[PDB]
Design a protein around this ligand. Sequence first.
Ligand code: MK7
Length: 259
Amino acid sequence: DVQQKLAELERQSGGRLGVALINTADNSQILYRADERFAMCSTSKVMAAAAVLKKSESEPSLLNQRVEIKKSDLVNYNPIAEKHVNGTMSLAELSAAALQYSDNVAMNKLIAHVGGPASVTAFARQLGDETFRLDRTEPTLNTAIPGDPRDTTSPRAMAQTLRNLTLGKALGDSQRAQLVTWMKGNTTGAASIQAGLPASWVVGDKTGSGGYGTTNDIAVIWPKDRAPLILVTYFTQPQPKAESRRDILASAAKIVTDG
Ligand SMILES: *C(=O)N1C[C@H](NOS(=O)(=O)O)CC[C@H]1C(=O)NC1CCNCC1
């Protein structure tokens, strides 16, 4: 059965695997270590962008507001922001960069705008997600030290929240659509959950990686002519310098779907 297959995959992987699937056809779930904490890494960018979208509902100019980019903002991973040094990007542009290029400067500007990691966390609490915690900014939020609760959530909580954000009513109509549009346009993701699904299925996802070989993906999935699914696959390893294992996420996706 599905639980045995996931346990076997986890054993083969040598690490710790967390899965939560929500099938909106029947409100059923497939859960594996779904209440354990895992470091989110770049998957936390979805919540930061959603927090800005929420604020924009009462401030219609917000997505157009200009944010300065300076050398001092640069970190290491900034493919979009590094092209606008001494200029500005709008909050919409920063959201797109964070979600589609995983730019870490862009994430930091979303965090700062809403008031910092504790404000992103407070947004999650307002949604009814009492598990999510964003503690740090980029780049340090990705350390993924085993046993460290900073910058973690559980698969169950993140699946339920991603469902709320992309399919439910957490966000206004325009803002929900915007988040879905951004996630459907991500430039990565094909090697993770998508690699375990049929070619025809439509996916909006956000990946992440970090210390301890942490390899993550969170997705909303539209199978052909079926109600959507939400899938969270989090994975981390014992060794600080372990390499990423996107194949494990693909394999988990294949196990928990009928595709
Ligand atoms: C997110 O987890 N990131 C951002 C960037 N893109 O990876 S993706 O998987 O999101 O596409 C690089 C990996 C990761 C990240 O921020 N890693 C840190 C880079 C700086 N050193 C510490 C790890």
